[model samples]
Target chain A: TLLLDYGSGGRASHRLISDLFLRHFDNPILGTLNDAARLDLTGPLAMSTDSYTVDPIFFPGGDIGTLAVHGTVNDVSMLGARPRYLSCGFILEEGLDMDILERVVASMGKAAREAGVFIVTGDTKVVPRGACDKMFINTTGIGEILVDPAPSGDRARPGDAILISGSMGDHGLTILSQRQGLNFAADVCSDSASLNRVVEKLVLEVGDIHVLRDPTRGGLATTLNEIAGQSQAVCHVLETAVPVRESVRNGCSFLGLDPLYLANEGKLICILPEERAEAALAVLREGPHGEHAARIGSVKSVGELGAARAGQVVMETALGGHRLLSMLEQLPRIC
Target chain B: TLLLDYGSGGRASHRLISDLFLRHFDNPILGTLNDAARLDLTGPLAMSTDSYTVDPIFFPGGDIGTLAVHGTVNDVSMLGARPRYLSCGFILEEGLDMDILERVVASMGKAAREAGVFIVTGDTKVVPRGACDKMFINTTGIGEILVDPAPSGDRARPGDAILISGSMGDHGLTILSQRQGLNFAADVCSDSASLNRVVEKLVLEVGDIHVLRDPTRGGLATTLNEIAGQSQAVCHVLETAVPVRESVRNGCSFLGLDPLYLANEGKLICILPEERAEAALAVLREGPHGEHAARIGSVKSVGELGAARAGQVVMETALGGHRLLSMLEQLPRIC
Candidate 1:
């Protein structure tokens, strides 16, 4: 079991850093063990931050460690930047299992390696057992911008095509299933993976991208509404065109949940000029974690649609009806 | 009361950010509302991360928010850098009082402004009430190096004089008194403040400083021991020369605590050549939060001390006797 002494900046803390943290996160910068890590980067840069507090700690497909690394990296990469360094901070509960912490830290090291970013600096604090859950991890990432005009939500235009990288609701339903002790026909796993590789490809191949974002926490419908509002445009989506796995679809149907409002960890939504959509789609499909890429919607100017539809997300059902989507409500801890 | 919906990344979350966060941390870079903040930092940079989980949340002189900002800023500034930006991450428990959050966040903004650093990026996550305390904050800072050869822990040398920025044990004992409901002869307050101004002054004035650090957790004895081990030298101290406020000294005496092992959030230890010590001391004494600055110790070559005393910290008592100081054994959450 981990003790409070490990959090005290003393012999035990030093031993923990040397024996555990250094063993896995060994790098010239982190190995120096200074109060802070020294870095040298020039030109436009991107910085992002996130804190992960997923319950059950361990889950199918990935754990908190993987999400912590991928979440911050994807946020930075979504800005058309190449993530370079990450800073990690952990709040651990006293008397946590030592093996569990080792597993999490080891997994973090592997995740950082896979994301092609260095864990250059970190801090750890241990609180009384009841004061916190098992652990919470915070990651802040910095990256170099790879594109001059970085993609932004407000850049979406009337003639932009909306492309989604993959299926949705896999992560949300998986966590819900675990919480409710419900079993589906097939095992559903969380779709948590780094998207920097694929993002870099898009930045290099399709430099004219407008808006790029991951549909996390509040899911696809909520994210689409955000872009529509920011760009002062309307988003029209064809429900049949968006991808959803059979297991997740069936699971959501049984639980009376809509896949459109369920969270996705490893999926991305790209909006760009219709003329370059094909090229962007091709690049995304050929890159890592984007095998199921598909074009699901398009942006329309307020003049092209009814004034009521402006700053709104309208979905076209297979039965030939239009349904307006609002921002998600009341789904907590889905990320 | 704050709800889980405030973290859902939807309308509620948007309103929370706009009404609370944006109002306090408003800046062009942060107002963009992108997944990441765009920056353009050049040349050598320093980055640091820290999480604050101090109990009570509010305390005398400073609260968790003030410490959260000052702590990370100090870490980056200790490397002889000018803190430029910071990323804030909050893990809040469900049903927390909104007023409390606003107070903390407002204090954070004031602290950041006082430190001359901008909060460029941030994230918030809310878990179930039992899963976490009221809230925990993590701040990661980035800064530009102001000195060509930045001070480091392993730079201490023989004949180096060690000067402390201010009085000891103020922050730690203040918290203890609050927790135990013990009244003291004089009210003690936390020594939490940013030191970048003083650090920058030293960088410009004393260009040949060896080591600079804040004795935060595990206090002066432990921090001195760290430098001794890192530089492979022996640190000899005059206990009488170290400054301790009379009230804090009496509190420690009554509690059977040693001031050397207590935390100080706003104090720093500077080590430099004997000839330059007076210049550095003058700079420190004139800086903010350094009114009680004093010359406390000196570094000695490992060969000059007994072989057994190598990589150790020794203190000479006022009675002309010596006592060895080892790494602190157990002092949790003093930070």
Candidate 2:
């Protein structure tokens, strides 16, 4: 069992760091045991912070540990930054199993190594049992911007192609299934993955990407809506062009869930000039974790789309009908 | 009231950021609406991460908001860093009152402004009722190192003068009193204030300080024990020389609590060359928050103490007897 003394910032806390955290995340910066880790960084840097409070700590494709690493890495990558370092903070409940904590730490170490980022500085705090759930992980990622005037939500323009790295709804569906204890013919796993590699490829090879985003807690629909509002353009998406996994679609249908609004962890919504779209797609398709990349939509002006105003996302159905997609509702803790 | 929708990363979430977060923390980097905040940084930097789970979010001297800012800033400052940018991650429970959150956020903005730092990036998540307490905050701070050979625990050498920044036990006792509803005639308030200014002054003026640390969780004894272990020296502290407020001392005695093991939020322990001790003391005494500064003792070699081993903190009592202070037991959530 994990004792409160481990969080007391005393002997046990030092022991915990040396035995567990340092053993896994063995880096000179972290091994120093200073109040803060020293870093040398320059140029434009992107910093992102996220707290992972997903329920059912263990899930189908990934656990909370991997989610914490990939989520923050992808967030920084979306801005065309090469994530280099991460700081982790853990809030553990008193009496939490030591085995579970070690497993989580090991997974974080593995994930960070694979993501090509260092876990430099971190803190651990244990609260009384019942004060918190099993555990919560907060990761703050810092990266150097590879592309000047990096991708942003407000940069989308008319005639820009909207591309997605892969299928949606896998992560959200998997969590829902595990939480509700539902059985399905085909199992769906969470799509938690670090997209820094693919994003680096896109930024280095085809460098004019306007807006990049990972449709996380709010899913694809909400993300597109956000882009539309930010850029003051209409996002016209083709329903059939958007990709969805068969298992995820089936699972969502069974649960009466809208896949368009279901979270996806390992995906990116890429908006860029129409001429550069093919190059960007080619770069992504050849990169790791982006084999199923597809262009799902195009940015259009409100006048061209005959929309009443900008900041609207219209979806075209298979039958050639058009409908507006609004912001999503409360789908809690999907990350 | 705060609802699940506010954390949906949808329209409501944007509104919350604009109306609540952005209203107070209005900065150009945060206003960009990108997946991450872009920063320009160079040279050796220090990064620190901490999670604040203090109960009774509001206290006499400062609330959790100010505590969050100051704690991380102090951690970075103790490393001879300038304490530049901070990223905040909030995990709030569903149905929390908006008023409470607003107050906390406002306080954070004010504290950040006063501390000369920017809260550049942030994330918010809401869990279902009972999943968490009122709220938990995780702040990750990044700063540029001001000193080339930064003060470190391992740098504490034998014959170094041990100095303290201010009185201890105020923060720990205040939280205890509030949690237990104790009505002491003399009220003790938390000493939660950012120490960057004083730290910068020390780094710039003192120039040869060997070790710097804030005695937070596990208190002065645990911290001294840590430095002793790290440096392989004995910390010989004089009980009469350590400063403590009258009210704090009385409260600790009445509650049968030892102030040595109680947490402190604003005090820093400085160890430097004995030849420059007077100058350092004069510098600290002239600093804003170092009015109660004192030279508590000196670092000693294991040979001088004739002890079995190093890593021992011996306290010389007023009666001229010595007592050994060991690693303390669980004093939960005192930060």
Candidate 3:
């Protein structure tokens, strides 16, 4: 466990960050911490905010610091925009080590550089002892909205093919393995990588791409539901077509957790017109981060299938029986 | 004892205030919880921020809500500006009474209206049980810069007259009286009224006013010391000239605290050139809030008096002797 000092020094650090940095770039709209941050943009600007509260700030594949930067960048990438600037805010518990803080900051800098985003401004506050468990980071990102309205979630039309970039559940399984003290003969490392390059490649190759989403917290099931709700279309995902690593599948089986519901930090879902699906998949496969891209599902007209009559999610099981996957209970407590 | 829910509900309240009010009106340059908020006005704008950690939430004189509003308003008024807008943030513990919250909000509204300022934006957060006493409020205020030349502590020149707006030590004594369960026949309510109106009168009536300061946390002696250091001049206050209510004097005497070091919430210190001294004194005397105002002392050259030789503050005794007052330490933690 990390400890931090919550005295005058902590107060001084907070004061310096607030007075020096926030004062220079202060604006009326962003000053207030409201429910929805309203921003003025020339075009359809990409905006995303993410909160990170990973325990043991440091992990095998990546730490919370890098995770925060990559998370927001990927969120912006899903909009087919070029991420530019980021603002970070940190809640540090009293008694955190300065050495650990330095390492976290260094990792954040590296991650931001890789994502091609600049961290323009940030805020830091130190709470009293026991007031916070550890460090929690919240980041908001702004990206230049490319002139491409063809790639919106609502643009998914009937007969559009759905594809996923790479293997699923690697990031989730790795975290669970580390947290639950489960060591495998072949160590499973988190696939935590920036997805901007892969997103750009697909957007540039096939302009008919309809929607893109990162399977994060609620994983593939949640991501599919979001698309279905947004487009008001029926989605049919084939279980055999979805890619999952053997190690991750074995781990999920042991833990009684579904791979479809587990998180993937670096993977993404791409939905495109059937005629351009092959081209999009090829581009994703050629990208640096999407070597295992595959077509997993297709978009159908509303009420086209029997399950669509009831507005239910339909997934073709391995045994060739249609099964309904209920919406996973979203239990975001600490993060 | 008053208990404030410092968790989800508390956070909700804070967000509503910050999002709805603070962002709508003030548009402060740095309204976030930074150490020293910066203002971009050409002239020196009044900047005042205060924290309130009051017990029982409600008291005989005022509650934490009212105190949070009046406290920052008074600080801005001490700078001789019309209090324009306020940003309030609250940290509520879990399980506070809704009725009490409504009453507190009403009190805050009344105070803001009376001060002729809007409660613009605010933030709220919750902590677990035992993390906070009950409720803590932090408020920052922005006032228009009405003075031609910026008025600051360094503006007080030698031979300038010092004027105090009203009787001292009333606020501190009242809080102490209630907190310590001291029985007093007289009503020692907190003198926490907004001083913007009185300050506006002084600025308009006496244009040669050099400096204005409120004796809040550190009282008269501390405020004088701060001004002396800033102006690099010696302050000589007359013990016989300093005004104090009989009850307040008795209260301080019983608590073994000097009346000079006791706090005053509704009073101000005005430094003026000798030419405008009489006019400023007359203006303060004519104001409704300044009924007990008086000329306490004058600023002297660096080496005018024996204590002034060492750049020390000296108060002339009634018996024609001089004594140096020690600086007060921060109050001990009560919880």
Candidate 4:
């Protein structure tokens, strides 16, 4: 049983930290158990914050533990930064199953190791049962910016090409199915993975990337609209080029949902010069996590589409119909 | 009126961030609204994180919002770092009062400004009602290390003298009374304030400090025990030297609790060479928030204290008696 005293900042709290957290994420700086961890770095750095409270705690493909690490890692990677260190803050509910806590901690440790980022510093708090859910994890990361003229939302231009790293709607559909306990015989899983390695490679090899964004809670269409509004460039997306797993598409269709607006954990949208689009697509296809990558869309001037404002995302349907994709509608919290 | 759609990372999420968070924490770095905020720090940097689970959302002297900022700021300050940048991630429960969130966010912004730090980046997630309490905040900080010979727990020696920034048990007892709804006529309040300004004064005015620690969750007794164990020395605390507010003491007494085991939010434990103890105390006194500084105890040889081994803390009573200060008891979610 996880007693209240274990979080009372007493001897028991110390024992819990040393025996559990330290025993799992044991690193030199964190082993010191100081109030803060000092890091040495010699370049422009990027930092981002993310809090994970995905429901069902455990889901197909990955649990909230793995998603927590991946979410923040991808956020930093979207900045064209090389993921380095992360700080985790956990808010746990009292009387939480010890087994659940242990599993989450272990999963986070494994994910951090695989992502090549150190969990340098962290804090933990436990509230009464009614005061909190089973758990919530917050991660903040600092990384090194490798590319100059760093990737940003406003950097995309009229001639930029938009490419997606992999399949969409997997994460969102997985959560929806699990939350509603809608068991389907078809295989479906969340594509929750870090994109640091792939992004770093793309920046080093492809070069001149204008914008990088992960289609997470907002998914593809919403993310493209963000780039469009920020850059004042009209985004023209091709429905045929968009990638969605067969199972996820069927799941969305049955639920009267559009896959374009569903969350994806492992996908990233890279906008670069149109001429370099093929090269970039090849690079993504060569990477392990981006095997199903595709050139989904392109940027254009509002005058080209004879539209009033260029800061909007227009979709070219499979039937050759033109429809403007506005901000994504409401979806469940899946990330 | 709070909805899970606000956390969907969709249009609602964007609106919530811009309309609410941006209006309060506007800054050049965070204005871009990129995935990450890049920082430019040339020296060794300290990174720390804390999750605030204080109940009642609102308490005397402060609220959960202010406590969240102060907690992360103090943790970084203890490293002798000038608090500079911070990231806030909040998990809000659905159906929570919007007024409450507005108050909390406003409080956080004010605290961040006063602490001389920037809320560079942040994230928000709303969970279903009953899945979480009103709210839980996690703050991660990065600061510039300014003090030479950075203070650490392992640096304490037998000749070091321990000093506290202010009174004990005020924070812990205040929450207890509020949570239990024990209305006391005594104006007791939580000492929930940032120590960055005063700590900067301390390191500048009094040089060569060995260690700096905050007596939080487990109170002075638990914190002292941690230091004792880390430094492999016996902590000899004096009951007479320690300062506790009259009201706080009475509250603890009535509740059958010991002040030594209670928690403190706005207190700090400074251990330095005995020769410089007086000088450090003077420095703390000059600071606005640390006017009531006092020397609480002195480090002692384990043999003289009749201890089996080093890394144990014992207390000297007011009536010329001595006893070991055991681990603190379980307190409410005060921090």
Provide TM-scores for the models.
0.98, 0.98, 0.56, 0.97
Question: In candidate 4, how many Å is residue B190 off?
Answer: 1.4
lDDT of each: 0.88, 0.89, 0.65, 0.85
Worst lDDT window (10 residues) for model 2 chain B? B182-191
Candidate with more favorable, higher lDDT: 2 or 4: 2
Weakest 10 consecutive residues of candidate 1 chain A by summed lDDT: A302-311
lDDT, model 2, position A205: 84
Q: Which tens-of-lDDT digit does each residue in A248-267 have in candidate 3?
A: 78888997777887777777
RMSD values for the candidates in order, in angstroms, are 1.3, 1.3, 10.1, 1.6
- Interface RMSD (Å) of candidate 3: 11.9
- List ranges where model 4 is wrong by over 4 Å: A183-186
Candidate chain B TM-scores, in order: 0.97, 0.97, 0.85, 0.97
Error in Å for residue B158 of model 4: 1.0
In what order do the candidates fall by lDDT, top score first? 2, 1, 4, 3
Error of 1 at A163 (Å): 0.6
Residue range B61-90, candidate 3, lDDT tens digits: 677777878877876666556666565555
Better of 1 and 4 by TM-score: 1
Q: What is the lDDT of residue B159 in candidate 4?
A: 76
Per-residue lDDT of model 4, residues B14-45, tens digit only: 88898888888878888888889977776688
Task: Give the residue spans of candidate 3 off by over 4 A.
Answer: A1-335, B1-47, B286-288, B307-311, B330-335
Best by lDDT: 2
> What tens digits encode model 2's per-residue C-alpha lDDT throughout B1-335?
88988888888888998888888888998888779999988779889999999988998888889888999999999899999899999999999999999999999999999999999989989888888998999999999899889989889998999999888788999888888998564558898988888889888987888999999988999999989988989999999998888899999998888899888988899999998898888877875458789999999988796573599899999898988988876667776
Candidate 2 lDDT for residue B264: 90
